[PDB]
Amino acid sequence: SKETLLQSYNKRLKDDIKSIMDNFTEIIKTAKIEDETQVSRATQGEQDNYEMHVRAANIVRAGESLMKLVSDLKQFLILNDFPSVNEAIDQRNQQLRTLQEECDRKLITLRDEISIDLYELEEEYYSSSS
Amino acid sequence: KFQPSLWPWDSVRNNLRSALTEMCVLYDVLSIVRDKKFMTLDPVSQDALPPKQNPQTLQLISKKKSLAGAAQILLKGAERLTKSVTDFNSELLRLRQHWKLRKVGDKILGDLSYRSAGSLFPHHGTFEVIKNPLDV
Amino acid sequence: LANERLRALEDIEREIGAILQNAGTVILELSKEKTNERLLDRQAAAFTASVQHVEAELSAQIRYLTQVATGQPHEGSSYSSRKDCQMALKRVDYARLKLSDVARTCEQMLEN
């Protein structure tokens, strides 16, 4: 339903913000240097490098998901935000009415001028001697 | 030499299966260690002398390199977003500004008939909207 | 119409700014010497302010969308006015063609 879709959007937003914050905080925490005990410097360093790269990838993925959320929200607004549909419909209607009225005024003035010319031509043609 | 039709993503499988071999080596060695037969354990007190101050300097250079790679992937994604934003929903703006639209399921449909304008014509004008920027 | 959409565009740009501020902060932390630790604090506050107001804008817009959603397909339209405008324009076109024909017969009469 509409409620269900809006809830789902809220869930996605909360999840994305939470993920960006958590990944950044975890990267900062690993960035701490600590004294080693039973971790074998080389292994500890490679594991830390992998963790940082994976978390950065996760942050970028969360940003892409936030872009997807913004796009979905834009689609919902363009499709069913009733006020803006009403202002678009009304503006379209008023513009088309003004164009119709301009066309009809042009046609009516054309008819009157053509009618006066027709009167002159009728007098000339019917009163021709031949 | 042939594999289940995976001609891209083969080298990732090589690295992952090499990891799978050495992880099976770890499971193997700790399992045969875990039984008393075929492998045994002896507690030995032995000590090592570190020739250089290894945790300080090694943790330093490794953490600066790790933070370098992390900032690289982050800022590369950032500039990808910059070039990525610099067109579909603008055409949906224009199309909704002229036409009557709705959404059912994932599909986005539109009405083409004058039934909003008063015709009781037994034919629905449902046209689909298809991203291809936009088509009908 | 341009208002809420421009808000969505701004939130797009600020998501980019959030990622760039993350990247700039770890850029400054990766430096061998990072003298501008005050600027590190400024970039950190910039990052957190970006994430927080992105959350604020998107939460506000989901709330506003919750207030004006109906689940019904909006039975309004603007078809009849477009139809009448098309008929008016085709009246004008018909009169143009007929005036061309009358002017052509007048040119044939005056031409001799």
From Swiss-Prot, chain A:
Q: What start-end ranges are recorded for coiled-coil regions in this protein? A: 84-113
- Keyword Coiled coil set for record: yes
Superkingdom of source: Eukaryota
Q: Which GO terms describe its cellular component?
A: core mediator complex; cytoplasm; mediator complex; nucleoplasm; nucleus
One GO molecular function term of this record is:
transcription coregulator activity
Keywords of this entry? Activator, Coiled coil, Nucleus, Transcription, Transcription regulation
Biological process (GO) annotations held by this record are: positive regulation of transcription elongation by RNA polymerase II; positive regulation of transcription initiation by RNA polymerase II; RNA polymerase II preinitiation complex assembly
Location in the cell reads: Nucleus
Just give the chief location class: nucleus
Its quaternary structure? Component of the Mediator complex, which is composed of MED1, MED4, MED6, MED7, MED8, MED9, MED10, MED11, MED12, MED13, MED13L, MED14, MED15, MED16, MED17, MED18, MED19, MED20, MED21, MED22, MED23, MED24, MED25, MED26, MED27, MED29, MED30, MED31, CCNC, CDK8 and CDC2L6/CDK11. The MED12, MED13, CCNC and CDK8 subunits form a distinct module termed the CDK8 module. Mediator containing the CDK8 module is less active than Mediator lacking this module in supporting transcriptional activation.
* Described purpose of this protein according to its UniProt entry: Component of the Mediator complex, a coactivator involved in the regulated transcription of nearly all RNA polymerase II-dependent genes. Mediator functions as a bridge to convey information from gene-specific regulatory proteins to the basal RNA polymerase II transcription machinery. Mediator is recruited to promoters by direct interactions with regulatory proteins and serves as a scaffold for the assembly of a functional preinitiation complex with RNA polymerase II and the general transcription factors.
Family note: Belongs to the Mediator complex subunit 22 family.
Official protein name in the record: Mediator of RNA polymerase II transcription subunit 22
Species source reads Homo sapiens
Q: Which residues of the full protein are shown?
A: 10 to 139 of 200
Curated annotation (Swiss-Prot), chain B:
Query: Where does the record say this protein resides?
Result: Nucleus
Tissue specificity as recorded in UniProt: Ubiquitous.
User: Associated disorder, per UniProt?
Assistant: Microcephaly, postnatal progressive, with seizures and brain atrophy: A disorder characterized by postnatal progressive microcephaly and severe developmental retardation associated with cerebral and cerebellar atrophy. Infants manifest swallowing difficulties leading to failure to thrive, jitteriness, poor visual fixation, truncal arching, seizures. There is no acquisition of developmental milestones and patients suffer from marked spasticity and profound retardation. Progressive microcephaly becomes evident few months after birth.
Q: What does the similarity note say? A: Belongs to the Mediator complex subunit 17 family.
Q: What does this protein do?
A: Component of the Mediator complex, a coactivator involved in the regulated transcription of nearly all RNA polymerase II-dependent genes. Mediator functions as a bridge to convey information from gene-specific regulatory proteins to the basal RNA polymerase II transcription machinery. Mediator is recruited to promoters by direct interactions with regulatory proteins and serves as a scaffold for the assembly of a functional preinitiation complex with RNA polymerase II and the general transcription factors.
Self-association state and partner proteins as the record states: Interacts with GATA1 and PPARG. Component of the Mediator complex, which is composed of MED1, MED4, MED6, MED7, MED8, MED9, MED10, MED11, MED12, MED13, MED13L, MED14, MED15, MED16, MED17, MED18, MED19, MED20, MED21, MED22, MED23, MED24, MED25, MED26, MED27, MED29, MED30, MED31, CCNC, CDK8 and CDC2L6/CDK11. The MED12, MED13, CCNC and CDK8 subunits form a distinct module termed the CDK8 module. Mediator containing the CDK8 module is less active than Mediator lacking this module in supporting transcriptional activation.
Supply the source organism for this entry.
Homo sapiens (Human)
| Gene that produces this protein | MED17
Swiss-Prot record, chain C:
Q: Which protein is depicted?
A: Mediator of RNA polymerase II transcription subunit 11
State whether it acts alone or in a complex, and with which partners, per the record: Component of the Mediator complex, which is composed of MED1, MED4, MED6, MED7, MED8, MED9, MED10, MED11, MED12, MED13, MED13L, MED14, MED15, MED16, MED17, MED18, MED19, MED20, MED21, MED22, MED23, MED24, MED25, MED26, MED27, MED29, MED30, MED31, CCNC, CDK8 and CDC2L6/CDK11. The MED12, MED13, CCNC and CDK8 subunits form a distinct module termed the CDK8 module. Mediator containing the CDK8 module is less active than Mediator lacking this module in supporting transcriptional activation.
Write out the GO biological process terms: positive regulation of transcription elongation by RNA polymerase II; positive regulation of transcription initiation by RNA polymerase II; protein ubiquitination; RNA polymerase II preinitiation complex assembly
Q: Which GO terms describe its molecular function?
A: transcription coregulator activity; ubiquitin protein ligase activity
Is this entry keyworded Plastid?
no
Q: Where in the cell is it found?
A: Nucleus
Task of the protein: Component of the Mediator complex, a coactivator involved in the regulated transcription of nearly all RNA polymerase II-dependent genes. Mediator functions as a bridge to convey information from gene-specific regulatory proteins to the basal RNA polymerase II transcription machinery. Mediator is recruited to promoters by direct interactions with regulatory proteins and serves as a scaffold for theee assembly of a functional pre-initiation complex with RNA polymerase II and the general transcription factors.
The family database entries (Gene3D superfamilies) matched by this protein are listed as:
1.10.287.3490
* Keyword Methyltransferase assigned: no
Q: Where does it primarily localize?
A: nucleus
User: What is the superkingdom listed in this entry's lineage?
Assistant: Eukaryota
Entry-linked InterPro entries: Mediator_Med11 (IPR019404)
What is the gene name? MED11
